[PDB]
Amino acid sequence: EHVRRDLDPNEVWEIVGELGDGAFGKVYKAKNKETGALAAAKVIETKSEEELEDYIVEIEILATCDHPYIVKLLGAYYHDGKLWIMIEFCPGGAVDAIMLELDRGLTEPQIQVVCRQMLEALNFLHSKRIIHRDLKAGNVLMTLEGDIRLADFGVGTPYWMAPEVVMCDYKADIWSLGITLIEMAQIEPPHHELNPMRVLLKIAKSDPPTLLTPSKWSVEFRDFLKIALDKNPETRPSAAQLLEHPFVSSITSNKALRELVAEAKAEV
Ligand SMILES: COc1ccc2cc(-c3c(-c4ccncc4)nc(-c4ccc(S(C)(=O)=O)cc4C)n3C)ccc2c1
């Protein structure tokens, strides 16, 4: 249903500005002409027909995800050789972008929240037989309320990649969670220093990576990191399992986040 064809998205949406620039395009901000809703948009000019035919399934999936911690899709359109996709506006921005804005990493209370919610959001997906395949700071979004919104942004280096997936199975995401934590914890992920080539290999021969300044953080955090960053996919735990861990089982309030977001709304 949700993918319209032979309607110009400019008839339903105005573009009021840009947000940055990635790799399969720029990020646009957009205002629903008739209903007022703000959106973030993504345009994709396609070479092939299958290329497109494939993204159309991606999207109809996102359509069946009604969760409080996953972005909602607000409309999608093929028109004049291009394909636009309109996601819920999250005015706290992406997490990575905050760290870069504040020039710093997250505190533990703040990581705790983000993790808590990513876990709840993952559990949902895996329970719908769905993999995300692409967890990172950059796909974790923010409301002012201080809730996350998990975002796909497409389905180019991959530090958050799992071991079993190299050089070349829900459990892959969980690994990528673990890295993202470290990412938020240190702005940059492990092996940032390296060449995209050598990362892959580095992730393979390397022991599970740990935190850079270990006595800066709790037992609960690392004990959580350690058990999530299992290189065997089999002995690596599920979403729900991790949700029972103390690091996140205690977490009821997003204040820590929320205040972070508010800070960034002032530095801007
Ligand atoms: C498949 O449809 C889409 C369309 C637009 C998308 C935009 C983003 C996004 C958004 C976003 C911002 C506000 N509300 C929603 C999203 N922000 C970013 C983003 C992420 C990182 C950075 S940064 C400073 O680290 O270069 C900047 C932006 C704008 N992305 C990739 C993320 C996923 C998106 C997905």
Domain extents in the chain: 1-89, 90-268
122: CA distance to ligand 1 center in Å? 19
Distance CA(107)–CA(110), nearest Å, equals 5
Is residue 96 flagged as an active site residue? Answer: no
94: CA distance to ligand 1 center in Å? 6
- Secondary structure, 3-state, the chain: CCEEECCCHHHHEEEEEEEEECCCCEEEEEEECCCCCEEEEEEEECCCHHHHHHHHHHHHHHHCCCCCCECCEEEEEEECCEEEEEEECCCCEEHHHHHHHHCCCCCHHHHHHHHHHHHHHHHHHHHCCCCCCCCCHHHEEECCCCCEEECCCCCCCCCCCCCCCCCCCCHHHHHHHHHHHHHHHHCCCCCCCCCHHHHHHHHHHCCCCCCCCHHHCCHHHHHHHHHHCCCCCCCCCCHHHHHCCHHHHCCCCCHHHHHHHHHHHHHC
Distance CA(162)–CA(233), nearest Å, equals 9
Pairing of strands 148-150, 140-142: antiparallel
Q: Buried b / exposed e across 208-217, counting CB within 10 Å, b at 16+? A: ebebeeeeee
Structure tokens at 144: 């002012």
Distance CA(179)–CA(173), nearest Å, equals 10
What was the experiment behind these coordinates?
A: X-ray
Declared resolution, Å? 3.0
Between 3.30.200.20, 3.30.565.10, 1.10.1040.10, 3.40.50.300, what CATH number should domain 1-89 receive? 3.30.200.20
- Specify whether domain 90-268 bears CATH 1.10.510.10: yes
Pairing of strands 82-88, 73-79: antiparallel
Distance CA(229)–CA(174), nearest Å, equals 8
The reply to whether 226 sits in an annotated binding site is no
